[model samples]
Target: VTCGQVDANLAPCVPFLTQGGEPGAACCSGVKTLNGNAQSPDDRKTACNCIKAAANRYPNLKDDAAQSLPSKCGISLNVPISRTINCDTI
Candidate 1:
């Protein structure tokens, strides 16, 4: 999908990771939507890349809030957050 599409599916998560945000309804929904869309390696790379850069910008992003995002969002993407995650998994 286009970066714009990925952004749409993930932009809501940005604010929630760095503060006393509730990962709002829209944010959780976006997470699920992004996960659902990243069904292939190329697509996953795009989603992951978009997410990493966004997270990287938030230096104060909480570890639990960042690491636990997948769980909170009820998804199964196991990888690092708040950094440039590996894009060449086999």
Candidate 2:
């Protein structure tokens, strides 16, 4: 729910999103774990906001890569995956 935990959960995705490549064990597994962990609306919103903040910190993150990450990780989220996503709506 917190940014720190969000960072830890999503750390594995940074490489693939920023550098471009197929998702690995930690990447896909962690994403699935993160999605499931954000079980409530508020929890998901906090995570969404944190992810947006973190994603923006990385200038090299790929647009398509982020957009596809959820599906690629085998889960669907209530929020969109993008820095521009309206986290407030989540």
Candidate 3:
């Protein structure tokens, strides 16, 4: 969603990464450059691993709800949530 379309409190989609954790260089790079201004597809594809890793850390996050996060951020998943394994695997 456009900046204007988002609410003041939810305008940004923060990539949740664990501190002192092992994440790929490319994943970290994507997080550093993440911004609401980028295209939805680009953000989703680029930040896929980071996002999934975040969800993986928070095991209590409901499946259906977590699945909706990308769309809420105006990002469309490249693949089905169920088919894409390790979404919340730690």
Candidate 4:
């Protein structure tokens, strides 16, 4: 996948993550798409790196919000969504 796709997949979560609110349908859809597409280790790592970069771009992004994404969206990832996560290791 491309960075543009990653951005499209994650941009919807920005508002939910920055502000105190539940993720919307679009956000959940993006999360599901991201989870479903990243099926390989390399793909997962690439996605993780992209997400980490996106998370880092938002200085005010809440850790709790990031952590809650997968659970709230009913999706799972091989690695957690954290800015500090080592994508290389995922």
Candidate 3 lDDT over 1-90, as tens digits, reads: 222222221212322222212334443333234433234664444344444444454445456543554444454434222224652332
**lDDT agreement of model 3 with the native:** 0.37
Any idea how many clashes model 4 has?
0
Q: Could you give candidate 4's per-residue lDDT for residues 1-74 as a string of tens digits?
A: 66678889888888998884788899889888888888888888888888888888888888898888778877
The positional error of residue 41 in candidate 2, measured at the CA in angstroms, is 0.8
lDDT of each: 0.69, 0.82, 0.37, 0.81
TM-score of each: 0.77, 0.91, 0.34, 0.91
Write the number of the candidate with greater lDDT, choosing between 2 and 3.
Answer: 2
**Which residue runs of candidate 4 sit more than 4 Å off their true CA positions?**
none
Tell me how far the alpha carbon of residue 88 in candidate 3 is from the true structure, in angstroms, after superposition: 17
**Candidate numbers sorted by TM-score from highest down:** 2, 4, 1, 3
Q: What RMSD does model 2 have?
A: 1.2
Clashes of each: 0, 0, 1, 0
Decide which is better by lDDT, 1 or 3: 1
What is candidate 2's CA lDDT for residue 31? 78
